[PDB]
Amino acid sequence: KVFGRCELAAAMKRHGLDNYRGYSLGNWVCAAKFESNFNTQATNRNTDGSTDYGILQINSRWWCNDGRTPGSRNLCNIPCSALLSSDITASVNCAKKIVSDGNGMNAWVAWRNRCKGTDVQAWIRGCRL
Ligand SMILES: [Cl-]
Ligand code: NA
Ligand code: NA
Ligand code: NA
Ligand code: NA
């Protein structure tokens, strides 16, 4: 599914991401825009052989099992294919674990380089939340 901006913001709020670990909702919408263009089915293969999955581009080296990333972990205890669902529950639950790991949202390269330090509230402007 390709979400709309305000549609995704509402879904992320219903799933508890607004102000999770201190990160306002606009941060999460901004990260999803630049990681996946709001597309739950996005995949991208990395240099090390791992793959990033879903709306928040969660990586198979640490967070999910895709059966083809040798010596990797599965810290979210899910198949990576669960992160491609039109339902964002699995991506949200795993993202909550990632953002609690110590480096906050700096784990997402697109967030650090394109959202951090900007007016992220603009990403939820106009939305009925
Ligand atoms: Cl933090
Ligand atoms: Na990316
Ligand atoms: Na990535
Ligand atoms: Na893995
Ligand atoms: Na870690």
UniProtKB/Swiss-Prot annotation:
Disulfide bonding pattern of the chain: C6-C127, C30-C115, C64-C80, C76-C94
Gene3D superfamilies: 1.10.530.10
PROSITE patterns: GLYCOSYL_HYDROL_F22_1, GLYCOSYL_HYDROL_F22_2
Catalytic activity: Hydrolysis of (1->4)-beta-linkages between N-acetylmuramic acid and N-acetyl-D-glucosamine residues in a peptidoglycan and between N-acetyl-D-glucosamine residues in chitodextrins
Tissue: In the egg white and polymorphonuclear leukocytes.
Entry's Gene Ontology BP terms: cell wall macromolecule catabolic process; defense response to bacterium; defense response to Gram-negative bacterium; defense response to Gram-positive bacterium; killing of cells of another organism
Primary location group: secreted
SMART domains for this protein: LYZ1
Record's function text: Lysozymes have primarily a bacteriolytic function; those in tissues and body fluids are associated with the monocyte-macrophage system and enhance the activity of immunoagents. Has bacteriolytic activity against M.luteus.
Name used for this protein in its record: Lysozyme C
Primary gene name: LYZ
